[PDB]
Amino acid sequence: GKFMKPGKVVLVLAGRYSGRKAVIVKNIDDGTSDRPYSHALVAGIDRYPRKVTAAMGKKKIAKRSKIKSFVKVYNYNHLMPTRYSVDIPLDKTVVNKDVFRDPALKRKARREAKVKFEERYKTGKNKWFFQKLRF
Amino acid sequence: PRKIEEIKDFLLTARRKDAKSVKIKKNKDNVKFKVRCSRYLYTLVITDKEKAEKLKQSLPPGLAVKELK
Amino acid sequence: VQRLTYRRRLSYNTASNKTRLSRTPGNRIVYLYTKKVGKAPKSACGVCPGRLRGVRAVRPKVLMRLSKTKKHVSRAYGGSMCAKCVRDRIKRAFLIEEQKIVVKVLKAQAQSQK
RNA sequence: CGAUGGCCUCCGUUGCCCUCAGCCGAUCGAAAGGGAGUCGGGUUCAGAUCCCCGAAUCCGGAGUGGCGGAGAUGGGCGCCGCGAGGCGUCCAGUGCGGUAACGCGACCGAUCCCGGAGAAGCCGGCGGGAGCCCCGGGGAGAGUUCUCUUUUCUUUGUGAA
RNA sequence: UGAGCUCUCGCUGGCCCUUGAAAAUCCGGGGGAGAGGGUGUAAAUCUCGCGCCGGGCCGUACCCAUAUCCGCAGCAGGUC
RNA sequence: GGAUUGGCUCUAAGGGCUGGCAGCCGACUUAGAACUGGUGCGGACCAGGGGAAUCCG
RNA sequence: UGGCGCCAAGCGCCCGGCCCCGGGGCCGGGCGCGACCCGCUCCGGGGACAGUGCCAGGU
Ligand SMILES: [Mg+2]
Ligand SMILES: [Mg+2]
Ligand SMILES: [Mg+2]
Ligand SMILES: [Mg+2]
Ligand SMILES: [Mg+2]
Ligand SMILES: [Mg+2]
Ligand SMILES: [Mg+2]
Ligand SMILES: [Zn+2]
């Protein structure tokens, strides 16, 4: 049946954020009034962490392993789904469709997404999600 | 040439060190204030009259003023 | 009717001696020499015949004085490749990577059976 | 690595070592090919996109960069304060918006690599925009008026950026 | 007001056993080597706005044609 | 190889804009008719003589 | 399948400087596998003929 769930990893296909990897946080397969097309709110990473390695100090490690995230609602036609998924928890109250009516709490949503992405990336799990797509 | 449309930035450019002189053109239905800077000539156009001659004393004292007769 | 003459010393109708009529405040018709028409950059795809959007179409040496945003569009490969070809490239890269992964896993399975 | 000057700060000047790497071949060859960027008015006996007046514009340069604006100024916790607002710890901050085409005043980045513009024949048809011509009037000045002719003729504007 | 004339911009088609320049110069992108600061007087850095200084050398008059050119000439010729 | 062609006065057909219709604008054409001139009308200018055959290319 | 690919990852062995308590921490370097070893023509293709120099005959 339907495969594009609220835990999927999606390759974003258009817009300023093109070629980035995001995670769907809330899908809507039936268009709402303001958006007749089916869509989904996702959280992605804009600046991937740099290729860290050994033989460098952990101050440099921390400086390089820093993520810049974005939160956006996308049309389904501009999203390419994958077979991967990440179980990273995102707070629904902070990250929701109401975040776009002001620029104050959108910064909070991006902050929370960035913090969660960093603490998950530091563990080394889902490492594919944190490497840029070479295209 | 550059047109200034709001009142105060005209005085802001008038008080710049670069500004050389301001000339006042008084035609019918318009009053034009032309301030000559290094790069552009800034024109401010006033439709009514009373704003014009209550601004005429608002220019900096050290800036040359020339009434076009 | 006032017949008018050239203003430069080039008396031939070459590609650089192109003019247009204009009315001076002195109530006269004079020649103004026109710049050549620029072209918007062509896509790096090599297939799409149109020219890129969002980029000013001026001569190459005029690009030196334009601002950065006037010469490109804020997207990956923006200002040099069209959006359709960018999407196709993205899909192709991801799909070939997946194909390679599945081929490698099938090879590993075959080796395990061997 | 070695030396100098400048408040020897930080940088400049070199001299040596390490490291980095192709050239399509020195050079010449177009006053019609390519080639950034100046227009209007006035002026002489003879010169004007060149002189004067007035509006611009391109390229190059600047220890201290001259200055604004952007990078930028947020969140959490313990607090004070009724609050406003103000303290002490942590954490982020190489911009932001639009589903998208893309937009916003800027929005770090080297060697290297890819691409674009420069950079393209002849002919046909059609459409848009100017200049000119044309028609009906308002003015201003001239011509005919033996008869007629609300008549005939001239003129009736705005540069670059 | 006009299938009016000229110029220019654009769309579209036809023809080729013809396919109809190069370089100087300039720009965008991919990458991500480096640099900045520890919360501030913020720093590195800005293709944004304004401001400061300079642009050297050579040609420039006139004829351009039944009289300023070439034909021995103020030549019914020739000359883009 | 034939006919016509001037001048003048008409008629008919060929369209746009606004609110099967109504109103308001309009650009050149084409055809037909009457009248008329000392049969003259592409009145100046511009502007193919024709046909039947042979030789050669 | 009209994508990307360089300027090492990793591993091993040494060294320096700073700090803290011989050990640890912090910063910054060197070498070697990764990328096997040895060799006498850069690889191929011809070759004592092509070819060249000088004589002789024909045309
Ligand atoms: Mg030329
Ligand atoms: Mg040369
Ligand atoms: Mg030349
Ligand atoms: Mg004009
Ligand atoms: Mg001359
Ligand atoms: Mg015969
Ligand atoms: Mg013949
Ligand atoms: Zn394309």
Structural account:
The structure is cut from a larger assembly and holds chains A (135 residues), B (69 residues) and C (114 residues). Helices cover 18% and strands 27% of the residues of chain A. Chain A contains 2 helices and 5 strands. Chain A has helices at 58-64, 105-121; strands spanning 8-12, 21-28, 39-47, 68-75, 79-85. Chain A has a 5-stranded antiparallel β-sheet, covered by helices on one side. In chain A, strand 1 and strand 2 form a beta hairpin. The radius of gyration of chain A is 15 Å and the shape is globular. Chain B is α/β, with parallel strands linked by helices and 69 residues long. Chain B has 2 helices and 5 strands. The longest helix of chain B is centred in the first third of the chain and has 8 residues, at 7-14. The relative contact order of chain B is 0.28. Chain C has 114 residues and is of the alpha+beta class. In chain C, 27% of the residues lie in helices and 11% in strands. Chains in contact: A-C. The A-C interface holds A 11, 13-16, 18-19, 80, 82-83, 133-135 and C 74-76, 83, 86-87, 89-94, 98. Bound molecules: magnesium ion (7 copies) and zinc ion. Zinc ion binds next to helix 1 of chain C. Chain C binds 4 RNA strands through strand 1, strand 2 and helix 1. The PDB classes it as membrane protein. Keywords: Ribosome, Translocon. Cryo-EM structure of ribosome-Sec61 in complex with cyclotriazadisulfonamide derivative CK147. Chain A is 60S ribosomal protein L27. The organism of A is Oryctolagus cuniculus.
Strand content of chain A: 25-35%
Instruction: Give the strand line-up of the largest sheet of chain B.
Output: 1-4-3-2-5
| CA-based gyration radius of chain B | 11 Å
How would you sum up the global shape of chain B? globular
Give the biggest beta sheet of chain B: 5 strands, mixed
Order of SSEs of chain B, N→C?
EHEEEHE
Estimate the strand proportion of chain B: 35-45%
| Distance between the amino and carboxyl termini of chain A | 30 Å
Sheet with most strands: strand arrangement of chain A: 4-3-2-1-5
Describe the sheet with the most strands of chain A: 5 strands, antiparallel
Give helix and strand order of chain A, one letter per element, not per position.
EEEHEEH
PDB class: membrane protein
Keywords: Ribosome, Sec61, trap, Translocon, Translation, RNA binding protein, eEF2, CK147, cada, Translocon inhibitor, 80S, 60S, 40S, cyclotriazadisulfonamide
Entry title: Cryo-EM structure of ribosome-Sec61 in complex with cyclotriazadisulfonamide derivative CK147
Chain A: 60S ribosomal protein L27
